Amino acid sequence: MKLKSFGVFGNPIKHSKSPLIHNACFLTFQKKLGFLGHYRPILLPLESHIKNEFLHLGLSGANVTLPFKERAFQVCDKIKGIALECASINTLVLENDELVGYNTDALGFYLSLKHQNYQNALILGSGGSAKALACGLKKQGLKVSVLNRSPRGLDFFQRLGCDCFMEPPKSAFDLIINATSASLNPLNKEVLKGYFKEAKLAYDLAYGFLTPFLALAKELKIPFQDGKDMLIYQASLSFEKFSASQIPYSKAFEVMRSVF
Numbered sequence: 001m002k003l004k005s006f007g008v009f010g011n012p013i014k015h016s017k018s019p020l021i022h023n024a025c026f027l028t029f030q031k032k033l034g035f036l037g038h039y040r041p042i043l044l045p046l047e048s049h050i051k052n053e054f055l056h057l058g059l060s061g062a063n064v065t066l067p068f069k070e071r072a073f074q075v076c077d078k079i080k081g082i083a084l085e086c087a088s089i090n091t092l093v094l095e096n097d098e099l100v101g102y103n104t105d106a107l108g109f110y111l112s113l114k115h116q117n118y119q120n121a122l123i124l125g126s127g128g129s130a131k132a133l134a135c136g137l138k139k140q141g142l143k144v145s146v147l148n149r150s151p152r153g154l155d156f157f158q159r160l161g162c163d164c165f166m167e168p169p170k171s172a173f174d175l176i177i178n179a180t181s182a183s184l185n186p187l188n189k190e191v192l193k194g195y196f197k198e199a200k201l202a203y204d205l206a207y208g209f210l211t212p213f214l215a216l217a218k219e220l221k222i223p224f225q226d227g228k229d230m231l232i233y234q235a236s237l238s239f240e241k242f243s244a245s246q247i248p249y250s251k252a253f254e255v256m257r258s259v260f
Ligand SMILES: O=C(O)C1=C[C@@H](O)[C@@H](O)[C@H](O)C1
Pocket: 008, 015, 016, 017, 018, 063, 064, 065, 066, 090, 091, 105, 129, 231, 234
């Protein structure tokens, strides 16, 4: 039976658990799919082109992670769904010898919840991961405030029409976040401390261990959440696509939940 190759592009990449959850699905659904899928971590030079290399390795699909999501958006041949208004894609597909981009962090992060009760939120960090979040919450009608001491391309949220800050809003929020090329190892403990209190939900993109960020977070007897549930939702959605839509996301989501 056919070996179809896939992977997650990134740098760094060794800690990604995408291979675990996608391979659970390829094995589970090969009868329905009619090929053997194999998903693998691909560590990418920062200087390289995802496009040239996706074809070099003859992938059929792939995810994109830090820091290639916007670089990725550029080199598609076609871009579909919410991606058009995200300027970042996390999912690639060869369809008809055409490279097609999607973005699943959006919906992914959204489905990450669960009960449709919320009005606004505050996004620390100015990355592709946050771009799709913002844009994702707007669509789900929210009052979205971004905050990053970084500035360039912070216009995106501006052009998109949400409130941009380089100083914590003397305000009170239902969701705080973080999507920083920092965290390795955010914003000063105090500016943080004050905001965190009377927040409705905490939430960190990152998964694996407990981050400085959340480590504290929970400590303050707060409702919390980490990247796990999102990782799975956005993967199941990318899988649906990988399956050229033969496998529904939510079926994938069950298989994936039950290994990780
Ligand atoms: O760690 C991972 O494998 C991933 C993380 C997120 O950025 C996702 O958007 C990406 O598709 C996969």
